[PDB]
DNA sequence: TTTAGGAAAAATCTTAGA
DNA sequence: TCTAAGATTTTTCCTAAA
């Protein structure tokens, strides 16, 4: 009859605000807030758990984080929806979220009573679905990363790949957003 | 006794959490949110308020956000306290804003209980910088002239070479002249960099 | 403090197979 | 679209003069 949950997020300010968000529902039941993927992931097989809520950046260096992440958690726990909640607002970016067939995705911007509403949409969102109606999977993860600011080596060491690769990646991204050098790259990610 | 804050950011679900960690505070009388500056300047004379819990990034046009936002509080509403929590660990631009004269600032980060030790620090006039904010600026001070042209030509958009071609010296001289400024800065890498000089411009 | 030289690294520019 | 191995450019690293 109840309903499991799981927070995951680097910003404890957000794991208590969600962890209170959801105590206004009594059929949730928030069976344990997490910080890191290498604890999340040792911690789902101990926690039968039905819905998990988590965001994009995350410090993790075994099982990673963003869509290699979710690609992981879509492999090994099938039985598990996840509705992922992010603080950027980059189009490509999300629309690079969106394209990986979950649960639901929740911005942090307008969104003080869309996420109960995407919690029980889980049962049968709002704003962002009213922005719903561009860049690939790979290169919005590459430009995640640089954003949060791990250089292009950094990011070729952090997903196992060549730092050549991650150079066409970004700079085709660049290319592809109309985007000259590095200054207006961030200008944009931040915008 | 008592203590009146305005609560100011642009993420809903982070005011939220503000709002309910503040709540377990009785003497805290929570008198608004706002979650941009150009409604937060509007109510701010119509609200007799003591203390302002504020992060840098904030979507105003009119008054700015960030230090531009802090000076303008600072000069227009002096008898105002603020606590300044921010999401980001650049020690440049932490330093940049303790050297405003702020009454206290504390990361997002680590810091359940951190924030209400700060606001309990404010009632005997004393500030609260906790051990997560020292370890931030541990890391970084005086700049000489010679990087502050590097920086300056650098923060337009010039490419090493493009400054070491402008001021007819070699690449490696203004390699090492940026290397050094961010050495004294505590600044690790080149976007942390722009983040810091996109912010003090 | 300012200025570089050789060595090394980091990042890009081609060109190209899946 | 994803991946990457050359040549090539760009930047840094150690080191060291004044």
């Not at 290699?68 to 509705?83: A, E, G, N, V, W």
């Not at 942090?108 to 704003?127: C, F, I, M, R, Y």
């Given at each position: 009859?109840?309903?499991?949950?799981?927070?995951?997020?680097?910003?404890?300010?957000?794991?208590?605000?969600?962890?209170?968000?959801?105590?206004?529902?009594?059929?949730?039941?928030?069976?344990?807030?997490?910080?890191?993927?290498?604890?999340?992931?040792?911690?789902?097989?101990?926690?039968?758990?039905?819905?998990?809520?988590?965001?994009?950046?995350?410090?993790?260096?075994?099982?990673?984080?963003?869509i290699?992440?979710?690609?992981?958690?879509?492999?090994?726990?099938?039985?598990?929806?996840?509705?992922v909640?992010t603080?950027n607002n980059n189009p490509a970016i999300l629309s690079a979220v969106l394209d990986l067939?979950?649960?639901?995705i929740?911005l942090?911007?307008?969104?003080?009573?869309?996420?109960?509403?995407?919690?029980?949409?889980?049962?049968?969102?709002?704003?962002s679905?009213?922005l719903e109606?561009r860049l690939s999977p790979?290169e919005s993860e590459?430009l995640r990363?640089?954003?949060?600011?791990?250089?292009?080596?950094?990011?070729?060491?952090?997903?196992?790949?060549?730092?050549?690769?991650?150079?066409?990646?970004?700079?085709?991204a660049?290319?592809k957003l109309?985007?000259?050098?590095?200054?207006?790259?961030?200008?944009?990610?931040?915008?």
């Open positions: 009859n109840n309903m499991n949950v799981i927070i995951a997020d680097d910003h404890p300010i957000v794991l208590f605000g969600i962890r209170k968000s959801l105590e206004q529902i009594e059929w949730v039941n928030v069976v344990g807030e997490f910080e890191d993927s290498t604890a999340l992931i040792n911690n789902l097989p101990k926690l039968d758990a039905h819905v998990l809520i988590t965001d994009l950046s995350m410090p993790g260096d075994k099982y990673g984080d963003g290699t992440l979710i690609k992981y958690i879509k492999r090994h726990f099938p039985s598990l929806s996840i509705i909640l603080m067939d979950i649960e639901g929740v942090k911007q307008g969104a003080p009573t869309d996420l109960p509403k995407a919690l029980a949409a889980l049962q049968k969102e709002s704003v679905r009213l109606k790979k590459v990363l640089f954003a949060e600011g791990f250089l292009v080596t950094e990011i070729a060491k952090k997903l196992n790949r060549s730092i050549k690769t991650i150079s066409s990646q970004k700079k085709s660049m290319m109309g985007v000259e050098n590095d200054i207006a790259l961030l200008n944009y990610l931040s915008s």
